């Protein structure tokens, strides 16, 4: 197809993000003199499914596929390079006078726009967090999308026996029953909002992940971050409803943040 590329079109450099994303490398697309990101493999069928899924993703706030090398090993998935790295590090290291309250709303609007698209197109993320959001010039935020899965919106997925999750971002139904849906992404988005409001603080600070579920089932939720608007915190708490069906859709969340962003600008 139009996606299939020669492997030699790309010059590979060093592993990006300190290796936290696995075999993902900075690279040069020589023809265009363009810095790109390249995921390689050095499981096969999982990798090639990722390549297949990425071909169908087209949204301003989801990392764009540029091409693939899927004929013979080594296999490549080639995407745009996000110059400022991930949102977690960006928030921690930023100039807060430049990255102000309106910018935080702008970033939340972008992420929710992407998540509304996945909600519309029957995709599930399963690992929404600041570390999996990527930053470009002018506070452009794109959701990392290698591991997106096909799942009709409303349907559920059961994780494998002995699967380990990032507990502090993980919905109660996922922790207890390994159940994932678009509504568990909504929960994770709530935790992501908390990350944004605190400029990249660790969720449930000082609380060991092994004790988080027990707090959640006793009705504990993180308190409102300093400087966070009441309206934004009420959205967080709505994302953290125990019952998945009680949580808002990403369509409703995006509409709320778009309104808040527009009013903050005016
Ligand atoms: C498809 C989405 N995805 N899933 C995993 C990785 C990517 C990704 C795509 N394009 C990317 N472009 C950049 C980065 C990235 C992230 C963190 C970093 N510290 C760095 C970095 O070292 N510098 C030089 C800024 C680079 C990650 C990705």
DSSP state of 227: T
User: What is the DSSP code (8-state) at residue 72?
Assistant: S
CA distance 111 to 84: 16
CATH of 82-266, one of 1.10.510.10, 3.30.1360.10, 3.40.50.170, 2.40.240.10: 1.10.510.10
Could you report how far apart the first and last alpha carbons of the chain are, in Å?
A: 46
Q: Is the CB of 81 under 6 A from ligand 1?
A: yes
- Contacts of residue 214, defined as CB under 8 A and 6 or more positions apart, other chains included, come to none
Sign of CA pseudo-dihedral 211, 214, 215, 221: positive
42 among annotated binding-site residues: no
Residues present in the chain in total: 266
How distant, in Å, are the alpha carbons of 7, 180, 245, 253, 260 from that of 184? 37, 6, 10, 14, 24
Owner of token pair 């922790």: 175
> Is 6 marked as a binding-site residue?
no
Fold of 1-81: Phosphorylase Kinase; domain 1 (3.30.200)
Q: Where are the beta strands (DSSP E) in the chain?
A: 10-15, 24-29, 34-40, 65-69, 76-80, 123-124, 133-135, 141-143, 149-150, 157-158, 179-180
Which position among 9, 127, 155, 208 bears the catalytic label?
Answer: 127
Give CA–CA dist 76/4, Å, rounded.
10
Whether residue 87 has its Cβ less than 6 Å from ligand 1: no
Tell which residue, 217, 253, 226, 238, has the closest CA to residue 115.
Answer: 253
Residue 7: how many other CB atoms lie within 10 Å: 16
Residues 173/179/183/188 CA torsion (nearest 10 deg):
70
Ligand-binding annotation for 261, yes or no, is: no
Tokens of 79: 């995407």
Q: How was this structure determined?
A: X-ray
Q: What single-letter DSSP state applies at residue 90?
A: H
| Cβ 50 under 6 angstroms from ligand 1 | no
Looking at residue 58, the DSSP 8-state letter turns out to be: -
C-alpha 12 to ligand 1 mean position (Å): 14
Domains 1-81 and 82-266 share a fold: no
Burial class (CB in 10 A: 0-12, 13-18, 19+), 144: buried
- Nearest CA-CA partner of 235 in 254, 215, 261: 254
Please report, to the nearest 10 degrees, the dihedral formed by the alpha carbons of residues 235, 240, 241, 243 taken in order: 130
The DSSP line for 132-196 is GEEE-GGG-EEE--TT-EE--TT--EEPPTT----GGGS-HHHHHH-EE-HHHHHHHHHHHHHHH
How far apart are the CA of 144 and the centre of ligand 1, in A? Answer: 8
Residue closest by Cα to atom 4 of ligand 1: 144
8 A C-beta contact, residue 115 and residue 128:
yes
Catalytic residue at 127?
A: yes
Is 179 exposed, middle or buried (CB count within 10 Å of its CB: 0-12, 13-18, 19+)? middle
The rounded distance, in Å, linking the Cα atoms of 49 and 81 is 21
The rounded distance, in Å, linking the Cα atoms of 62 and 114 is 6
Q: For the chain, give every domain's residue range.
A: 1-81, 82-266
Q: For 75-107, give one letter per residue: b (16+ CB within 10 A) or e.
A: bbbbbbbbebbbbbbbbeebeeeebeeebbbbb
Backbone angles phi, psi at 78, to 5 degrees: -105, 125
| Cα within 13 Å of Cα(176), Cβ side | 11
Q: Cβ(204)–Cβ(190) under 8 Å?
A: no
């Amino acid at each position: 197809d139009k996606w299939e590329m020669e492997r030699t079109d790309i010059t590979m450099k060093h592993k990006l993000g300190g290796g936290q994303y696995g075999e993902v490398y900075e690279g040069v697309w020589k023809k265009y003199s363009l810095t790109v990101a390249v995921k390689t493999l050095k499981e096969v069928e999982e990798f090639l499914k990722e390549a297949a899924v990425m071909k169908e993703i087209k949204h301003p706030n989801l990392v764009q596929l540029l091409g693939v090398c899927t004929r013979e090993p080594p296999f490549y998935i080639i995407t745009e390079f996000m110059t400022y790295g991930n949102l977690l590090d960006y928030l921690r290291e930023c100039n807060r006078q430049e990255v102000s309250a309106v910018v935080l709303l702008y970033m939340a609007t972008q992420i929710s726009s992407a998540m509304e698209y996945l909600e519309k197109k029957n995709f599930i993320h399963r690992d929404l967090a600041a570390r999996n959001c990527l930053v470009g010039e002018n506070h452009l935020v794109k959701v990392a999308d290698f591991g997106l899965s096909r799942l009709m919106t409303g349907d559920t997925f059961t994780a494998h026996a002995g699967a380990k999750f990032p507990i502090k971002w993980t919905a109660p139904e996922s922790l207890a029953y390994n159940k994932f849906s678009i509504k568990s992404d909504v929960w994770a988005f709530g935790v992501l909002l908390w990350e944004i409001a605190t400029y990249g603080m660790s969720p449930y600070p000082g609380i060991d992940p092994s004790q988080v579920y027990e707090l959640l089932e006793k009705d504990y939720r993180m308190e409102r971050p300093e400087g966070c608007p009441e309206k934004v915190y009420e959205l967080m708490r709505a994302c953290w409803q125990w019952n998945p069906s009680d949580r808002p859709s990403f369509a409703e969340i995006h509409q709320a943040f778009e309104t808040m962003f527009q009013e903050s600008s005016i």
